[PDB]
Amino acid sequence: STTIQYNSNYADYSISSYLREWANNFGDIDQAPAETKDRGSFSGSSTLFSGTQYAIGSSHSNPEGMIAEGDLKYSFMPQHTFHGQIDTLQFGKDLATNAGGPSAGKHLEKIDITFNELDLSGEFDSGKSMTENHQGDMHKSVRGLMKGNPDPMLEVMKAKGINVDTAFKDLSIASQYPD
Ligand code: HEM
Numbered sequence: 001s002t003t004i005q006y007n008s009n010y011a012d013y014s015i016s017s018y019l020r021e022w023a024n025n026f027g028d029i030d031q032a033p034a035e036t037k038d039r040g041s042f043s044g045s046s047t048l049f050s051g052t053q054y055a056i057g058s059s060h061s062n063p064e065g066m067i068a069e070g071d072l073k074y075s076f077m078p079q080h081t082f083h084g085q086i087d088t089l090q091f092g093k094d095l096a097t098n099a100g101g102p103s104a105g106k107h108l109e110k111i112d113i114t115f116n117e118l119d120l121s122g123e124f125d126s127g128k129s130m131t132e133n134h135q136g137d138m139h140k141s142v143r144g145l146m147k148g149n150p151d152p153m154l155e156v157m158k159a160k161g162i163n164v165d166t167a168f169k170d171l172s173i174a175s176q177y178p179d
């Protein structure tokens, strides 16, 4: 089952109210100056467009970041589809590069919310249209977030049985990180 750990400072937020605020501070990547644009960084397979970790900070010089872990793949040109399976999704601020450099992964210095066993997946077929491939849950939810829009991620979570309006302290699948 999907479970959540959250920082106590977010006890009164819901998943929806947390992602509203994270997404507006992250900002839309398509609106960002090409000089501060962070498209994200894959690590784990010593390659550029796949790996076991995908980490992305804000393109609008704000501290907000997001990290996904699983079996992660990105088709780049021409359909630009993120697919595979996300097992862990983590939100917070202050995205730092591990001592081994970008190829050794990144970590959030301030961790706000972690989804465990998210089972967020999507498939990619080069023989289909970009619009069909862009219907995969994984793709549309992460892409929405990159664009400052949390609504597709929230729709995915509702369809999985998660109430995105319940406060974290009242959510039966959520545990606070220890003081
Ligand atoms: C290291 C990771 C990534 C890099 C280096 C990267 C790089 C790029 C570049 C250079 C373009 C411009 C393509 C062109 O000029 O033809 C592009 C487009 C695009 N990327 Fe990525 N990208 C990355 C990750 C992702 C992820 C994870 C997603 C989805 C969640 C994504 C979705 C898109 C989309 C949808 C476009 C086309 C713009 C649009 O139709 O909205 N990218 N990417």
Ligand SMILES: [Cl-]
Pocket: 029, 039
């Ligand atoms: Cl991008």
